[PDB]
Amino acid sequence: TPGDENEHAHFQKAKERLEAKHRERMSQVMREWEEAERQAKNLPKADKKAVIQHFQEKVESLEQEAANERQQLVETHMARVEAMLNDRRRLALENYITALQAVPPRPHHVFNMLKKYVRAEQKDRQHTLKHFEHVRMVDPKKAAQIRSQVMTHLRVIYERMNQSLSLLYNVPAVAEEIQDEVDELLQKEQNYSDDVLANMIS
Amino acid sequence: SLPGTYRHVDRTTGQVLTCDKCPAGTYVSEHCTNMSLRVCSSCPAGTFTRHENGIERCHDCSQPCPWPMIERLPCAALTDRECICPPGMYQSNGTCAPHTVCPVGWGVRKKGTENEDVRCKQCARGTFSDVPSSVMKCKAHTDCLGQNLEVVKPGTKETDNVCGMRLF
Ligand SMILES: *[C@@H]1O[C@H](CO)[C@@H](O)[C@H](O)[C@H]1NC(C)=O
Ligand SMILES: *[C@@H]1O[C@H](CO)[C@@H](O)[C@H](O)[C@H]1NC(C)=O
Ligand SMILES: [Mg+2]
């Protein structure tokens, strides 16, 4: 998908900018450290040691600023990808529903749209998981904090899906027409959802 | 162990010392001893150190840029030289390859970089490319009605609409 490759490209470009900026700052600090040790070379040992401590503090500080800024980039990318996916989910849902209000209903069609809307909901959920996974990796304590929120979102995805199914259960002829293809779709879906909760608790 | 330090075994006394690292652009010319801090010296010409370090020799710079690559970054105390492909080419294998030209009927879909070839796509219905180019995108058919003319020959992927007037 062009939206996929494009979003990853903007994220990529942001990362490169950010690293260029950090590299320049670091480079400036390392030059100053070297010049300072040169200035202090005839001072007592404890004073040379203080020069070193000073600049290892500057370096540590820069490194944490940079780590922080990287997480911000990641957050911005995740939000954007979420918007893209929310869109696609809403589009699949509308198409499936107009397929379901079409008269006469063509179950071929309906099940195909149902297919893609379930895939959209799934890819939404996957993104949610991947975001949480990243948080857990880089910052397990935050992840422990937001877990509840993720679970409640997952419950929303469920409810929305269920209602979406109920609509099919409204128009019984079509439903019975395609019921076992629907049953297998829900089969592997149930597997996916299970996989997701598994990846969640650990 | 702590990240501003490195471990060093005194070569005579055999004592296990914790030395301080030296800054990037610098290498350890004298290890710390029992009595003394490590001493740092500047990377000599043609070498570099990218990071804070405890090593005894600076890294040799990369070879000078092989034709037709150009140098965006010179060899310096804190940086290896950086070689990249000239405009209109990209890194392929270990050299430079010309960007793919999108022929007639095709337009650029993903622009070409120094690391990545151009990606082409077939002009979609309603547009066209009548030129082979590694940079041009697809262009929409001329709107003939929009300047009070008729479509006398429908455009394709490769050709514009032909506008005209007709008598009967
Ligand atoms: C899901 O929605 C449908 C329609 O309301 C209903 O049949 C079913 O009871 C609901 N199930 C849950 C758990 O919400
Ligand atoms: C050498 O190291 C010992 C500990 O191993 C230390 O106590 C002493 O002050 C150092 N300097 C000397 C012996 O001149
Ligand atoms: Mg072309």
Short mmCIF file of C-alpha atoms in Angstrom, two decimals, chain B residues 42-134:
data_model
loop_
_atom_site.label_atom_id
_atom_site.label_comp_id
_atom_site.label_asym_id
_atom_site.label_seq_id
_atom_site.Cartn_x
_atom_site.Cartn_y
_atom_site.Cartn_z
CA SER B 42 43.88 13.59 18.99
CA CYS B 43 43.16 11.20 16.11
CA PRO B 44 45.87 11.68 13.50
CA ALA B 45 45.13 12.59 9.87
CA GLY B 46 43.17 9.87 8.07
CA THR B 47 41.67 8.34 11.23
CA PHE B 48 38.69 8.95 13.43
CA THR B 49 36.79 8.03 16.52
CA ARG B 50 33.05 8.36 16.38
CA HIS B 51 32.36 7.75 20.02
CA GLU B 52 33.59 8.10 23.54
CA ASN B 53 36.15 5.32 23.76
CA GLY B 54 38.93 3.41 25.51
CA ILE B 55 40.84 2.17 22.48
CA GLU B 56 44.56 2.45 21.73
CA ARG B 57 44.35 3.39 18.06
CA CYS B 58 41.90 5.54 16.05
CA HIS B 59 40.05 3.77 13.24
CA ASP B 60 41.46 4.17 9.73
CA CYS B 61 39.23 6.26 7.46
CA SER B 62 37.44 4.55 4.53
CA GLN B 63 39.19 4.55 1.15
CA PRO B 64 38.72 7.66 -0.94
CA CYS B 65 35.52 7.75 -3.01
CA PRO B 66 35.63 5.45 -6.07
CA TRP B 67 34.32 6.97 -9.33
CA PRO B 68 31.74 8.17 -9.69
CA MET B 69 30.86 8.54 -6.01
CA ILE B 70 31.33 11.90 -4.38
CA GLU B 71 32.27 12.81 -0.84
CA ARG B 72 29.57 14.39 1.23
CA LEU B 73 31.61 13.97 4.39
CA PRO B 74 35.32 14.34 4.62
CA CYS B 75 37.52 12.21 6.77
CA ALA B 76 37.95 14.09 10.07
CA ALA B 77 38.76 13.43 13.73
CA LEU B 78 35.18 12.50 14.57
CA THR B 79 33.98 11.12 11.24
CA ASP B 80 34.72 8.56 8.62
CA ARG B 81 34.54 10.01 5.17
CA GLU B 82 31.13 9.37 3.65
CA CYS B 83 30.83 8.50 0.00
CA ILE B 84 27.56 8.66 -1.94
CA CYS B 85 26.32 8.19 -5.53
CA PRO B 86 26.08 11.32 -7.74
CA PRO B 87 22.59 12.66 -8.70
CA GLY B 88 20.57 10.42 -11.02
CA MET B 89 22.26 7.30 -9.64
CA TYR B 90 21.85 4.96 -6.66
CA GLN B 91 23.91 2.53 -4.59
CA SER B 92 23.72 -0.86 -6.20
CA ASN B 93 26.01 -3.67 -5.16
CA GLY B 94 29.17 -1.74 -4.36
CA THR B 95 28.88 0.91 -7.04
CA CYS B 96 26.53 3.38 -8.69
CA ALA B 97 23.70 2.46 -11.09
CA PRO B 98 21.74 4.98 -13.19
CA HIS B 99 18.21 5.65 -12.01
CA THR B 100 15.56 3.64 -13.86
CA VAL B 101 13.93 5.67 -16.65
CA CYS B 102 10.10 5.42 -16.66
CA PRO B 103 9.33 4.97 -20.32
CA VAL B 104 6.44 6.24 -22.35
CA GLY B 105 3.20 5.04 -20.78
CA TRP B 106 4.82 5.16 -17.33
CA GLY B 107 5.49 7.81 -14.72
CA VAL B 108 7.55 8.11 -11.54
CA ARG B 109 5.68 6.61 -8.58
CA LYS B 110 8.48 6.73 -5.98
CA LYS B 111 11.33 9.20 -6.54
CA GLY B 112 14.92 7.94 -6.89
CA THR B 113 17.55 8.52 -4.19
CA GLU B 114 21.25 7.82 -3.65
CA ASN B 115 20.29 4.54 -1.95
CA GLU B 116 17.06 3.63 -3.73
CA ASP B 117 16.13 3.19 -7.40
CA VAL B 118 13.21 5.05 -8.98
CA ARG B 119 9.97 3.13 -8.86
CA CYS B 120 7.71 3.44 -11.98
CA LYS B 121 4.00 2.88 -12.51
CA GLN B 122 1.73 2.65 -15.54
CA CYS B 123 -0.07 5.95 -15.95
CA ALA B 124 -3.62 5.53 -14.72
CA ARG B 125 -6.64 6.07 -16.95
CA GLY B 126 -7.09 9.77 -17.62
CA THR B 127 -3.34 10.46 -17.45
CA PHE B 128 -0.29 9.87 -19.61
CA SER B 129 3.45 10.05 -19.96
CA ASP B 130 4.75 10.70 -23.46
CA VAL B 131 8.38 10.88 -22.36
CA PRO B 132 10.86 8.40 -20.92
CA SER B 133 12.18 10.08 -17.79
CA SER B 134 13.50 9.02 -14.43
#
